[PDB]
Amino acid sequence: SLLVDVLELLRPLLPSADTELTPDTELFSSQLLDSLALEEIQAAIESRWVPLPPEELTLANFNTPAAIAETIARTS
Amino acid sequence: QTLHAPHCEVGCAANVARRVGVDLARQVIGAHWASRMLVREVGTFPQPLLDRTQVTFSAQGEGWPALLARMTGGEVTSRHVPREELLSTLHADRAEGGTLLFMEDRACPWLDSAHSPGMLPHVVVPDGVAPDGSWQLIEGHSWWRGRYAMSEQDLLAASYPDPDPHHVAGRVLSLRIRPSAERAAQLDTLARQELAAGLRTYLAAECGETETPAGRIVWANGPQSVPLLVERLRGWDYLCPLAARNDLSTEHARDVALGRYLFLALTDELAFAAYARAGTLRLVEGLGLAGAVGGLRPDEAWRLAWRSGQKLYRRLDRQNLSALFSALEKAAEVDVEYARRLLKEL
Ligand SMILES: *P(=O)(O)OCC(C)(C)[C@@H](O)C(=O)NCCC(=O)NCCS
Ligand SMILES: O=C1CCC(=O)N1CCN1C(=O)CCC1=O
Numbered sequence: 011s012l013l014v015d016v017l018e019l020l021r022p023l024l025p026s027a028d029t030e031l032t033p034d035t036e037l038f039s040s041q042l043l044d045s046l047a048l049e050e051i052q053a054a055i056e057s058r059w060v061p062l063p064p065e066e067l068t069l070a071n072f073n074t075p076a077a078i079a080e081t082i083a084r085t086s
Numbered sequence: 087q088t089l090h091a092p093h094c095e096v097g098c099a100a101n102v103a104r105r106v107g108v109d110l111a112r113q114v115i116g117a118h119w120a121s122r123m124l125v126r127e128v129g130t131f132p133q134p135l136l137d138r139t140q141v142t143f144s145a146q147g148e149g150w151p152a153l154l155a156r157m158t159g160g161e162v163t164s165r166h167v168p169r170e171e172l173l174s175t176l177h178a179d180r181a182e183g184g185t186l187l188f189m190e191d192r193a194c195p196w197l198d199s200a201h202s203p204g205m206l207p208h209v210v211v212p213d214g215v216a217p218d219g220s221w222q223l224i225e226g227h228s229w230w231r232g233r234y235a236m237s238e239q240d241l242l243a244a245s246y247p248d249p250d251p252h253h254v255a256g257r258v259l260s261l262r263i264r265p266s267a268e269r270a271a272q273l274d275t276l277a278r279q280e281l282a283a284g285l286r287t288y289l290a291a292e293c294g295e296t297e298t299p300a301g302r303i304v305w306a307n308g309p310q311s312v313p314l315l316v317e318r319l320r321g322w323d324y325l326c327p328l329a330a331r332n333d334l335s336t337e338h339a340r341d342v343a344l345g346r347y348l349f350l351a352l353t354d355e356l357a358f359a360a361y362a363r364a365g366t367l368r369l370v371e372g373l374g375l376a377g378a379v380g381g382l383r384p385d386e387a388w389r390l391a392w393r394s395g396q397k398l399y400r401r402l403d404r405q406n407l408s409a410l411f412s413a414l415e416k417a418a419e420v421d422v423e424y425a426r427r428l429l430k431e432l
Pocket of ligand 2 (some may be wrong): 095206209
């Protein structure tokens with residue numbers, strides 16, 4: 011359900027409704043999302059689940075929806 | 087598996103330290119309590135490298151190179167090395183610690199920066215040759231943290247760029263830091279004594295200045311550091327209205343870009359404060375002194391300031407700056423109480 015929540019919060023950050031969003035979609039290496047989008051994600055996460063420290067802000071943790079959900083699950 | 091930190095050279099140093107049984111973040115960084123405002127501003131004319139008034143914050147104090155060297159009994163030395171000596175220098179450093187190797191952003195494919203050498207050079211930690219013959223490079227910045235492969239030919243090309251705007255050709259920082267066995271068994275004791283010393287420096291609240299060709303550099307330590315930092319940063323409240331305008335001249339465009347960059351660089355230093363304070367908390371816990379400070383969390387206070395800095399430089403909204411100021415005040419107030427109660431038990 012957390013993976014579902016992540017995908018939902020990610021959807022309005024995409025550039026267009028055309029954009030495919032799967033658990034494995036690359037978000038930042040592919041330039042799909044920008045710095046403002048990262049702010050929204052970080053803010054969503056500390057509002058809803060866990061205050062992520064700098065140590066957890068890695069491309070590995072944030073590049074796919076599945077990685078983000080993994081990050082939340084592991085740190086909550 | 088790879089260690090990392092908000093400043094790439096610190097994450098690099100953490101990986102080398104771990105090779106020799108030293109926990110950089112807990113026993114070295116975490117053992118060095120510090121808080122300092124720094125300003126570069128107009129001093130005595132002429133100062134041809136003074137391009138702009140500039141303000142930032144530091145929790146690095148004396149810095150990990152001095153601390154790491156004296157704690158281990160080793161040396162942290164910068165040198166420039168000829169191409170013909172680089173690989174052997176890396177193998178010789180490796181027996182005793184390791185090497186921080188400087189190189190341009192564009193020489194590291196994972197940074198996706200083929201178009202620019204960066205504002206400052208990058209740094210990586212070579213990790214010897216893999217069984218398949220490729221060199222391994224450790225990336226110490228959190229966002230890209232990991233291990234990367236590079237050919238021996240590409241490694242040497244990367245180390246001797248032409249042109250060389252950052253002047254990094256053959257530039258190595260050698261960390262020969264392997265402690266003796268007795269020293270290593272005692273490291274927490276040395277960290278405890280470094281911990282008290284930095285707390286005393288912090289409460290001493292010294293300050294100073296020096297005139298340089300790049301401007302007058304002013305610093306202030308201790309409880310006063312963050313109030314003085316906030317008062318100075320108020321001077322950049324023009325950023326958001328200026329950034330909002332769409333009639334921006336090329337000058338005002340530069341004003342916005344450099345103002346944003348001031349706050350981006352500040353934000354990296356807030357992140358480092360969060361990282362170092364968390365190191366201090368882990369050190370204190372392991373030392374059995376957690377009862378001294380009774381639940382105060384300077385690591386979380388600075389993490390909040392960090393997040394506020396991120397929002398500010400990303401958006402430059404009208405109220406982001408005051409939110410940052412609020413977060414810094416809270417971190418300043420947690421820091422001073424934490425330091426006073428911790429030092430009492432040391
Ligand atoms: P914002 O700048 O905080 O956005 C976050 C980011 C992940 C997009 C950002 O940190 C970033 O990747 N910036 C560009 C990376 C780059 O290649 N810059 C030059 C070499 S570091
Ligand atoms: O953390 C460091 C080490 C040197 C440097 O410029 N930084 C800032 C962050 N950073 C990278 O690590 C790659 C590009 C960049 O700006």
